[PDB]
Design a binder for these strands. Structure first.
Ligand code: NA
Ligand code: NA
Length: 326
DNA sequence: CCGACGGCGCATCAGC
DNA sequence: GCTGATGCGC
DNA sequence: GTCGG
């Protein structure tokens, strides 16, 4: 929090770029700057100081100078008071409502949740679900609840077919104390890249989770990817648990561990690992790890039966998810 | 100076 | 009706 | 907005 004022400012700017100006690359520039500053172990004294950090350029250095000298940023103060812009930025907090929808809603007088609640006919299925669980979705998930959630998912999956293999990834797998949602990767030996997916392997699992009333709503659902809502059972006489976001992806057996590695992260570790792999003559993406010829031509994907197989290929020591913060 | 900044499944729109 | 583009989330 | 070829 040494530079909380600065990081808060950059993050607020980031959101407006993304949600109002629809400049996704500026949104990411601000996030990157906020992150690099968030890790800086010194209270910044000037923009020049910050500019030394990778990601902080001329413009943000200038903004830090204004912030340090006046305690605010005129442009941010102005945008905050802007009725239209602050409303557009806000509505995007609803899952299903992006920059385009938020803009159209505000254009026609729909600026608040209350307004949204009054206009169900103008919201698609996803947006209605997002509105319904607006507050719940913004709540984090204690690891204890994530464990109780994993218990149900693993049990039911095995119940449908003991040959299914399911892994809850994300920061949770790395040991995080809280999570924002639940990411589940699923596979079955019967499903490979060059075989049939028996368009129901995913369906059968989603169905069982709905049957035991764990999954409560569906945002989207196809043959390989499910996105929805779930909720832990409440103990009689206790405030019921908040609804949570859960995604389930069915991945071909031969690409499963590249998927688990990828969705376990962190993002920083993935980049570092991808870099190391390249210098070792290997190209790793979320699906496979392939060899690179001397002319840069990628060969066919290499056999992978575990996360370690991946590490072994790039002569890197297997690292526990708990040690993949970077 | 000026292009990259990940890119793909699903729901829905837009053009035919 | 079918096909490709767009919005969205991740 | 920032970086870099
Ligand atoms: Na810099
Ligand atoms: Na949204």
């Amino acid at each position: 929090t040494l530079n909380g004022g600065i990081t808060d400012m950059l993050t607020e700017l980031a959101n407006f770029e993304k949600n109002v100006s629809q400049a996704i690359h500026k949104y990411n520039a601000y996030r990157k700057a906020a992150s690099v500053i968030a890790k800086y172990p010194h209270k910044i004294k000037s923009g020049a100081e910050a500019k030394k950090l990778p990601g902080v350029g001329t413009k943000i250095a200038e903004k830090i100078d204004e912030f340090l000298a006046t305690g605010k940023l005129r442009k941010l103060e102005k945008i905050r008071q802007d009725d239209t812009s602050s409303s557009i930025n806000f509505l995007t907090r609803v899952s299903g409502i992006g920059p385009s929808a938020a803009r159209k809603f505000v254009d026609e007088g729909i600026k608040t949740l209350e307004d949204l609640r009054k206009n169900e006919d103008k919201l698609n299925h996803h947006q209605r679900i997002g509105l319904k669980y607006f507050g719940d979705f913004e709540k984090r998930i204690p690891r204890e609840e994530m464990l109780q959630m994993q218990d149900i998912v693993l049990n039911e999956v095995k119940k449908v077919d003991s040959e299914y293999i399911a892994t809850v990834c994300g920061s949770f797998r790395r040991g995080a104390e809280s999570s924002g949602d639940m990411d589940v990767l699923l596979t079955h030996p019967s499903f490979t890249s060059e075989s049939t997916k028996q368009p129901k392997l995913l369906h059968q699992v989603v169905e069982q989770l709905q049957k035991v009333h764990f999954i409560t709503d569906t945002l989207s659902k196809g043959e390989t990817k499910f996105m929805g809502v779930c909720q832990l059972p409440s103990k009689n006489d206790e405030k019921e648990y908040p609804h949570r976001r859960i995604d389930i992806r069915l991945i071909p057996k031969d690409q499963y561990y590249c998927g688990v590695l990828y969705f376990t992260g962190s993002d920083i570790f993935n980049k570092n690992m991808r870099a190391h792999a390249l210098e070792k003559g290997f190209t790793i993406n979320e699906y496979t790890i392939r060899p690179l010829g001397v002319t840069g031509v990628a060969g066919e994907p290499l056999p992978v039966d575990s996360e370690k197989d991946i590490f072994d290929y790039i002569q890197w020591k297997y690292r526990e998810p708990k040690d993949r913060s970077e």
